[PDB]
């Protein structure tokens, strides 16, 4: 077959985005081999929601969305259909009809940054619960009480984005894990990205 697309670019990427600013790379009109991601057994945690990993070779879809973000080690349970937590209601939410898979692995040596990584941010405060597959990039000041603050970091008026404290010598805990969410959506349109023939 011809025109083999680089589907493994999202797993071997050199730069990852934050959780509140998660990127979505559209992949279309190519052939993907799913045995590289599941049969190689090189990832730490991986689980498909609704589909079987051995049946993606004969059952194929029209479009795939590749979501990539870096979360903590205990926070991998929040990336699931129907969950609540610190990033499930604020940064990234999966719906109950989620038919994709979640592939994750431990990025200990590369994304370590001894001394405190001050690049990746995440949301603790928000005025409402986040919709599934919705991204929030704008950064205003949260107001949990009746107090107008115009650029004031005083009482009850703070920044709504913190830093991921990452330590290289720690029992696993909040370890940075690179999570790639491959959404598998099947529509009534003619299919574009299918498996090997």
């Amino acid at each position, epitope marked *: 077959i011809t025109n083999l697309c680089p589907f493994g670019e999202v797993f071997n990427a050199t730069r990852f985005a934050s959780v509140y600013a998660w990127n979505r790379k559209r992949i279309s009109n190519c052939v993907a081999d799913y045995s590289v991601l599941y049969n190689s057994a090189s990832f730490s945690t991986f689980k498909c929601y609704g589909v079987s990993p051995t049946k993606l070779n004969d059952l194929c879809f029209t479009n795939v969305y590749a979501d990539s973000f870096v979360i903590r080690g205990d926070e991998v349970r929040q990336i699931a259909p129907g969950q609540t937590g610190n990033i499930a209601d604020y940064n990234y939410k999966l719906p109950d009809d989620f038919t994709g898979c979640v592939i994750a692995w431990n990025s200990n040596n590369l994304d370590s940054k001894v001394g405190g990584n001050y690049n990746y941010l995440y949301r603790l405060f928000r005025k409402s619960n986040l919709k599934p597959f919705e991204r929030d990039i704008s950064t205003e000041i949260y107001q*949990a*009480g*009746s*107090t*107008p603050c115009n650029g004031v970091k*005083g*009482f*009850n008026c703070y920044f709504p984005l913190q830093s991921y404290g990452f330590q290289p010598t720690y029992g696993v805990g909040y370890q940075p894990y690179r999570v790639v969410v491959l959404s598998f959506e099947l529509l009534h349109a003619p299919a574009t990205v299918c498996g090997p023939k």
Partner: antibody
Amino acid sequence: EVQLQQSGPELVKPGASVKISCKTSGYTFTEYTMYWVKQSHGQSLEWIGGINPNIDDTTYNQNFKDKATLTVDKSSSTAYMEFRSLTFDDSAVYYCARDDKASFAFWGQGTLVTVSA
Amino acid sequence: DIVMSQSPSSLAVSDGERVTLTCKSSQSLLYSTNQKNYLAWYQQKPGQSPKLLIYWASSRESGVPDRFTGSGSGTDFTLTISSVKAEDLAVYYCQQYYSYPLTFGAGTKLELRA
């Protein structure tokens, strides 16, 4: 509605300390914010300070610097206010103010603290 | 800090008359983003705890009777009661929510006649 159970009356001496509690019930204690209002001179209302229990932040008034401290208890859902270096002017009625919503702020019963020798 | 004044300090009212209470601030309490005036009106019964009646200077809280109407914006604020009753014998206060520290009013107590 919101149940704000305060302590009873205290009879203390100047120079000692006192503790004022305010137990909440019915709503989430870690969601809203806590405020304290001191009613002195019969009718005048004075603002002591506030302390959002979620991330434990605390602010105070200029009239109440280095006198009152605010701590919370997450396991019992009770707020604390402890006064140090009491004077004769501190003999007043202290109230527990809970900021549930901007439409109505819920008040307790009142803590009468009479300090004399 | 932000200070406020009440005018007057006491008013003699009879049953059936309308009463207006004036709360004037030293500066404007208008927030341009929310387009609301951060000011609250309280009422303290003798022997009871004070309760909030009018929030954001133009809205009536649920459970307050319809005689309590709030008005005003910016600096001049007015609490208007259409017809008082026997249960209206209390003291009223004025509190702003614009900035810290929170400032309470002087207190307006109603009387009888004559």
